[PDB]
Amino acid sequence: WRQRSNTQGSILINLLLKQPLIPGSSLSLCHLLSSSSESYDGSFSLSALREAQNLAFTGLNLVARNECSRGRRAFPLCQLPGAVHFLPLVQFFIGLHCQALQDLAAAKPEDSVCILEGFSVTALSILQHLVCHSGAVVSLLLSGVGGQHPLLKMLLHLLAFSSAATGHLQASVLTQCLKVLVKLAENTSCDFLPRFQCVFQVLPKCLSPETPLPSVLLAVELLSLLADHDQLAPQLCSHSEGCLLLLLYMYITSRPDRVALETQWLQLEQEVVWLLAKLGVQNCQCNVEVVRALTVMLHRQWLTVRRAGGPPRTDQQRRTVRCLRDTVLLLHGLSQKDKLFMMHCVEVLHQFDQVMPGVSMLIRGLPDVTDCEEAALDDLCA
C-alpha cells in the first residue's frame, strides 16, 4: 500500500532524524550531513565530502517524499530509492577510518580515528535503519563484483580489522557492523548467502572469548541466519581448531569477564539454542562439546529457577523457562543424533541427572506442555 509506504518512509526518515541514534553517542544523522572534519582526504576530499553530503541530503528529501511500495527478500521492507542516495555519504564516512585502520596497521592517527569511529558508529546505525525499511539499497549491496560491493568491501575490511583485535573502539564498531550484517542476512535471499563466505572467514575472530557478549550475540544471530543454505550449513565444522562452534560453546560454558547483569547473560544462550534448533531442522568435538555446554547451561538455569519456583511473573523468568524448554528439546535431539552423548557427557552428566527430575517437574508445572518435550524428557529418563 502507498499509505503504508508513506508511513514507512516517515519511519525511516525519523529513525534518521532523532536524538543521536545510539544513546550515549552524542553524534546524530546531521553529525554526518555537515561535518567540519578537520584533518582519507585524498580519496574523500572535503569537496568530495560535501558531494557525498548533498547526495545524502537529496536522498533524505526523496525518502521524506518516499512512496516505496514493497520469497527472495524475507520481508518486503520498502525497496526505497533514497537509500542508495544516502549510500554516498555513508560510503564516504565508512571508507573513513577504514583507510585509517588500514594505515595504522601499515604503521605497525588514533586520536582522530576515535572520533572517526564514533562518526562511523552513527553511520552504521543509519545503515541499520536503511536496511530496516528498504530493499533498493539492500539488493544493490547484495550485487557484488563476483568480488564485493564497494561499501560491502570497506565494511568487511573494517570488520576484519575490529575482529582481529577487540580493543577500545573496535568492539563497539564491531557490534554496530554486525547489527548491519545480521540485518543484511535477514533481508537477503539464498543466492547472496554464499557471498558472506568471507564473513565466515572473518567470523572466528568475532566468536573469540575476548569479544564481549553483545558482539558475539549478534555474531550467533548472523550464523543462525546463514544456516539456511546448503552451501553455508556445511561451513560449520571439520576444522580442528574450533570451526566457529568449539569457540561458541567455550564462550557459553565459560562466560568471559561476565561484566553484565543476569538477564544480559542467557541472551547468548537463547540465541545459541535457537541457532542449534535451526541447525537441527536443517563428530568435530564440534559435535561433542555442544553436549556438555548445553547441559551446563540447562543446569545453571534449573538452579536459578529451582531456587525460587514461583510463577513466571518477570520477563526474564519466562525467558529462562522457555530457554529451559527449548534446551531440553535440544538435548533430546542431541541424544537422537549421537550415541556417544551419554558417554562423552560424563564430566557433567551428574549435573544433568540431578536436573532431570527437577526439570521434568518444572516442565509438568508449565500449563502449556508440548508433547514432544514431554516425551523427550521421558526418553532422557533412564
Partner: protein
C-alpha cells in the same frame, strides 16, 4: 478529446512556469522542481511519447529542455541523481525515437542532452 480540451492551456502553463529564459529556476524551490524531475522521469518510463495522442508531447519535451539546459545540474537533486534521471530519460527517448512520424519535438531534447555530454567531456579533457 479529454486531452484536447486542455492541451493548449496545459502547454501554456508549461511554457509560463518553465520559460526559456535562464534563472527561471530560481523562482521555484529546488525540492519542488526535483519532485517535478522525478515525475517527468517516471512519465518517460511510461513512454508517454507513444502512449499519448497529441504531439503538442512537444510541451513535455520543452519542459525537459528547461530542466536540462536552463536549470543547472546539481541544484534540485545531486548531479548523480539528476544524471541517472536523464539516463532513464534519454533511454526512453531512444525507444520512442525508434518509431515516430515527426522528430522536431524530439531532436531538440537529444541535442541538449548530447550537448551537455559534450561540455562535460570538454571539461574532463580541459587541456589534454
Amino acid at each position: 478529446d479529454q486531452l484536447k480540451l486542455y492541451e493548449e492551456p496545459l502547454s501554456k502553463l508549461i511554457k509560463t512556469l518553465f520559460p526559456f529564459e535562464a534563472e527561471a529556476y530560481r523562482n521555484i524551490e529546488p525540492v519542488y522542481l526535483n519532485m517535478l524531475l522525478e515525475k517527468l522521469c517516471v512519465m518517460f518510463e511510461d513512454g508517454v511519447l507513444m502512449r499519448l495522442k497529441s504531439d503538442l508531447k512537444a510541451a513535455l519535451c520543452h519542459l525537459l529542455q528547461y530542466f536540462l539546459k536552463f536549470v543547472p545540474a546539481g541544484y534540485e537533486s545531486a548531479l548523480q541523481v539528476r544524471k541517472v534521471y536523464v539516463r532513464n530519460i534519454c533511454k526512453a527517448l531512444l525507444d520512442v525515437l525508434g518509431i515516430e512520424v515527426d522528430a522536431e519535438y524530439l531532436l531538440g531534447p537529444l541535442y541538449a542532452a548530447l550537448k551537455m555530454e559534450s561540455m562535460e567531456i570538454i571539461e574532463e579533457i580541459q587541456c589534454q
